[PDB]
Amino acid sequence: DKICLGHHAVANGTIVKTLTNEQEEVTNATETVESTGINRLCMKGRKHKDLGNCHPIGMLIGTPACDLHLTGMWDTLIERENAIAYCYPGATVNVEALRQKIMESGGINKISTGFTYGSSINSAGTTRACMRNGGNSFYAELKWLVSKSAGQNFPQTTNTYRNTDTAEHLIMWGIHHPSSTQEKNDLYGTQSLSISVGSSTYRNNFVPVVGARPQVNGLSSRIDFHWTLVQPGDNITFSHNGGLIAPSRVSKLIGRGLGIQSDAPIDNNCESKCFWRGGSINTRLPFQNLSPRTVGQCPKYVNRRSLMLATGMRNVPE
Amino acid sequence: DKICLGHHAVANGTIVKTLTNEQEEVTNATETVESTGINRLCMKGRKHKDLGNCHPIGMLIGTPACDLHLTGMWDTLIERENAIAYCYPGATVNVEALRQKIMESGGINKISTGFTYGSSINSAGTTRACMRNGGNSFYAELKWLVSKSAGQNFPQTTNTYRNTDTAEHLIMWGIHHPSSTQEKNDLYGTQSLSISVGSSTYRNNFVPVVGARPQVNGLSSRIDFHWTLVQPGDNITFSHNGGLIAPSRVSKLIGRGLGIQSDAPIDNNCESKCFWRGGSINTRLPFQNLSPRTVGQCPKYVNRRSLMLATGMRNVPEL
Amino acid sequence: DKICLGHHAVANGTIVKTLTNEQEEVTNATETVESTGINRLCMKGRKHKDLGNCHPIGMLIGTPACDLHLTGMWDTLIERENAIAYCYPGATVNVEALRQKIMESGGINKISTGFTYGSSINSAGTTRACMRNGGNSFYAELKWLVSKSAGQNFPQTTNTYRNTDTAEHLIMWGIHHPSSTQEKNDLYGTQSLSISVGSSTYRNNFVPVVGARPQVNGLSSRIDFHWTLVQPGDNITFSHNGGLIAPSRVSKLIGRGLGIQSDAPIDNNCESKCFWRGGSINTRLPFQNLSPRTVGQCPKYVNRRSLMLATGMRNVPE
Amino acid sequence: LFGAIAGFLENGWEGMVDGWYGFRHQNAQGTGQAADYKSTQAAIDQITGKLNRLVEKNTEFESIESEFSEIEHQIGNVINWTKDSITDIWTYQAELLVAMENQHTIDMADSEMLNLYERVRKQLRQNAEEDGKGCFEIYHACDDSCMESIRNNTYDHSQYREEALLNRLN
Amino acid sequence: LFGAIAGFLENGWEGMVDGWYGFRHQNAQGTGQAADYKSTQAAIDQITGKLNRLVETEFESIESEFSEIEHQIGNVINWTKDSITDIWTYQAELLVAMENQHTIDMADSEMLNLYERVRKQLRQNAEEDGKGCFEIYHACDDSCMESIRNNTYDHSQYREEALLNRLN
Amino acid sequence: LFGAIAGFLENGWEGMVDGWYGFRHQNAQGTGQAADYKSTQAAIDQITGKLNRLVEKTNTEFESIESEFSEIEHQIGNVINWTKDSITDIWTYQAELLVAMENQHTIDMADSEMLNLYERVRKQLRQNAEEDGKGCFEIYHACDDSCMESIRNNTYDHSQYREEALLNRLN
């Protein structure tokens, strides 16, 4: 006559780790490390812009491939891998800080600069390198100023952008470095060239660096870009002599957005808060081993395939 | 007959979290996260200097607002929200590194460069932009060198400072960027302008550049400031023919101090080791939630308003 | 009759810390924080390289001190306190990034530029500041160009290097800054000196500037070194008038290595994965208090002399 | 560690699929099995308590390293050192967490087995004795309804004490 | 957990104020309530060891409060700082959760140690009722009770009587 | 905490170099001592396990971001400094906690293995013995040297001595 106490067990237990013991068998366990991701950019509930083959830099200066991305509002901005910033050769000074400001924004507006040029300047120049609708063109947001009368000295010119708004504006310009002394003289005259840019807080000077001899060597025609922020109430003045690629518009970065670099297709039916190069991570687990490079609200990356949390007692089979 | 065992309880217990329960009632508990803080700078026990409306850079070049702050000794240096660096407008290359150097120091002495200039140089130029006694002045630790005889070519000039001391010195100079061709010509002549500076450990060189800009304290002209450390036993040589704003004193940073950016008022009767933009934090607690930006010796900032550490048994009151 | 249960104890117990007790006596315990290191760089099993008094930078430009270190291969590169980069006094732009690129590298190959100069140029400038075999010499990988006919204008000159390899190349050059007018005139002639360098990803102009300066290694004149990465298929051109310190060879960094700055002699018979200024750390403990600066695979640094882990019960003495 | 699961209890019961803890009994009429509701819930609630903290979620981060373009070499290295540092910290914390949690989970399940066993012992009072394998040898006839009153915690020990004592003693 | 607090003891005594643990009893001369000083002090001391560990580096600024920070280094600083804060916040939460779990079970423990001390003390003169009480099977006056609290009770003195009582 | 090691067992036994826990008996033949191997290996096995976790660290490869021999740019130096010090405060606090927590559990574990041996013997003795306040069992029948080993051997059959034992307990 007898009453016996005991506990359950299962035919197949799971192995977990404790302070005192690896290989400790328990009745049940769940995974604390998310190892599987969604290979798509879940954009439900997000006002987003996919930039396609348009690089964020391209947005501000108006490269043909960004003509549909010159303005917008968004809470999310998506950058793709081989996007185009430039149609004419050259590069942007301080490029990564500018790209991050753009990728941090919630949108862009454009404001016209109001710049006009005297009779002795041709401002409507274009180039075979920058094709738009099958025609020679140029950056939408800029003007290639040259001497209307070739070989002649570019006139000492003055231009002033005034920010009459209540937020900082981002103005970009370019400096043209000619491919030879022959090219430079024809566009801008024999005179020494100086391009001066001055605000209340920013000052700088630019001198076109003149290339040599063949076009296929390293010193050939390029337009390099510079930028700065213009504060509300402040003016910025360009004093130039030939070589300035002048802004016909400046940009205004608006609010905050989340910046995503990824080549994953946009899926509008799923919602997510964490992204990486490879797509999205949606999970309640506190750790992930998908990527050390994530943006948004994410589980912390860990160097482990599996970390099992016991959800049952020691499993003691008969 | 019987004897019984029991534990106490209280009418009103307090809720804590455990590993297994977020709503677990216990007899007593206490905070781990500091929430209050003090909206003043507790400076009791510190040799401090409040800079007021003087910006740390201004100490070195000698802006008027910094006249009571050109030398000193301190263990705490306090910077304020709109302190002034520049009377004559411009900027300083690597300005934030310089500001942090000054804000880590425990003081500054000044040391004359002993610079002298030939007859054809007027070295005491002044401007409306820098004022002492309501009249035209200039940076106390620099000199605006110009042609004594206007429009004339500024002479080729050499000036050498020699660090005969046993610690490194900080020398600052400016480069004048005029606002117009005419103005540049009046000050320095029509000749090409070149300034080159060189020590054993440093080489750079500069070109005064003319351009139209907005007025800042009524000026469209600009002075760009530069600086370098001159080591013990080394000399630094200025070669120039117009455009040099020449240093008349150098600085020496002495020792170490804690630098604070905050506009909370100074309070001399209370002491602290932890400071932020609002004044101070005094607590034995290991965690605080007042601000993610603190300097000194502080509790660690956390993203929670409250974490209670139980200091009693489970609370099991009568039914 | 009676039977009794008990545990063991020892005369001399060891104090450990718990959550509830600062001074708690247990039977045994062991240290969890390593305090002892080896006073040697244990280099066994590493293809290592001890640069001795050769500074990483001097490897690329070929200072006399680095003659034994101009090419090579390694998984570990050791830099030393007395290390020399410059014989002819000067400085290098972004010197710490460059140094770091060299110290992560796993070797260096050197490739001729092929630069030739006509009869107006003496390409064999040498100096007492750069002794090599008891004779006056110069950077091994660079050439001091000067006018063959003393005092005459250095000719306008164009040199172009093409990277025809499949990896990037690092090319270094220098700009001479004479110490007097007389020197500048003798070396290059009385003309205005201009040097411009251009690739697809670099454009710049330099102007030699005369200035009086203290003697370093006997010279008051200086050389400013510049550098850039030339990509596969790209070309980089030098247009120069005098003042250029031209590359005769360019570099190629190969693969990956671990950079060590240390004072300790090498031991090629001991093994280690963890290094600091004072040598190596070979321990199984998770923590150390030797140095907060270490490279490689190390225990984590902690601000504590000792941390005792109990390996036995409470000690209750008789 | 408490004494029961993988302790003085020899093994577990695969058969008992309706709870975590329970009773097997032996009497003149045979054999029966039953699970204890309260003790299994107490263990299960504490597990879910743990799980709830686990899935507690957070801070928005933005990119500090470009996926598709080059970063400056030196700040690149700093970011690298920093991320790898942060990652070793979370790795270690995640190992610690589950190791500590798992230990405590195990020991907690043990403790609820013991507390059940202890409750029963105190009920039976002087009417049973322990066999050291988790069974209580009862010293009177105990029919199905009597077994029920034990698991149901209404078993009155005084009702059987008289018989029980003289069976324990003769 | 140990079976006592919020366990086989139905509830706490709000009326005990001179300790965390103590004795209630019923006999001829009436009832009483005394707190146990030893058990109360092993619990409290353990608590103060944790508050000790609780209350035990100098940092300077790397973020200008009043001037612009270069943008790229600014984001690296934000990221690093937010990552440190996530770490400390997770550490703060785990510390308290883990500590509170232990404090409660330690409290429970010390109560069971006192219950266990008494049980072996009384030996074969008493039987537990399951609600935390020992039914004493002999006459036990106020000086017998303190004898149980003082841990001075000699079972052998009252044994033979108590055993005649337990068996009839 | 379990009631045993710093509790109802007055003090440890230095004399027992034989193992971690064990027996001391007293019978007509004499007094003696033995160490129980199961219980001690239970405790030690959990210890060597904590130690395996302590040294089981595979490690990330770090490179240098601070120059030993040349100066680093000031602002970047200060970011680095602040980061490394913030990492070190974390590891320092982690190492302190790890040990403090581990040590607390190691003691209480050792206490538990002791209480579990005691309970095993108490139950095994059944109605032939009673406990004093200390860790001893008063056995109410003559127990042989062979009988004593039969209690540590876990082979002691209580039904064999019960009648005798019950009689001594009551008379």
Ligand SMILES: *[C@@H]1O[C@H](CO)[C@@H](O[C@@H]2O[C@H](CO)[C@@H](O[C@@H]3O[C@H](CO[C@H]4O[C@H](CO)[C@@H](O)[C@H](O)[C@@H]4O)[C@@H](O)[C@H](O)[C@@H]3O)[C@H](O)[C@H]2NC(C)=O)[C@H](O)[C@H]1NC(C)=O
């Ligand atoms: C830093 O600046 C210092 C000041 O110019 C430099 O020191 C100078 O270097 C020059 C040349 O190397 C030395 O010049 C010579 O002097 C001797 C006579 O010397 C003795 O007499 C002088 C005059 O009373 C006295 O000051 C000295 O201590 C000696 O007792 C002549 O025979 C030579 O023709 C020549 O004129 C300077 O003496 C020397 N000055 C000092 C204070 O040492 C120093 O070179 C600069 N450092 C660097 C890195 O360039």
Ligand SMILES: *[C@@H]1O[C@H](CO)[C@@H](O[C@@H]2O[C@H](CO)[C@@H](O)[C@H](O)[C@H]2NC(C)=O)[C@H](O)[C@H]1NC(C)=O
């Ligand atoms: C930017 O330029 C405009 C004009 O070039 C400046 O504005 C004038 O400011 C004065 C006094 O503030 C007013 O009396 C005028 O009416 C303004 N002009 C107009 C048409 O609005 C302005 O001050 C400049 N900003 C800076 C910072 O220099």
Ligand SMILES: *[C@@H]1O[C@H](CO)[C@@H](O)[C@H](O)[C@H]1NC(C)=O
């Ligand atoms: C580099 O030079 C070679 C030979 O002239 C030429 O084939 C190539 O197009 C040049 N590279 C570029 C990108 O211009």
Ligand SMILES: *[C@@H]1O[C@H](CO)[C@@H](O)[C@H](O)[C@H]1NC(C)=O
């Ligand atoms: C002391 O501890 C170390 C490691 O835990 C161990 O090797 C040694 O056997 C212990 N010594 C004793 C006295 O047991």
Ligand SMILES: *[C@@H]1O[C@H](CO)[C@@H](O)[C@H](O)[C@H]1NC(C)=O
């Ligand atoms: C850094 O973070 C703070 C807090 O959100 C914010 O005000 C600031 O814009 C951020 N800085 C950068 C570099 O974006």
Ligand SMILES: *[C@@H]1O[C@H](CO)[C@@H](O)[C@H](O)[C@H]1NC(C)=O
């Ligand atoms: C950075 O911190 C280290 C540690 O004290 C110190 O040696 C060094 O001087 C500090 N460097 C800077 C940037 O001031």
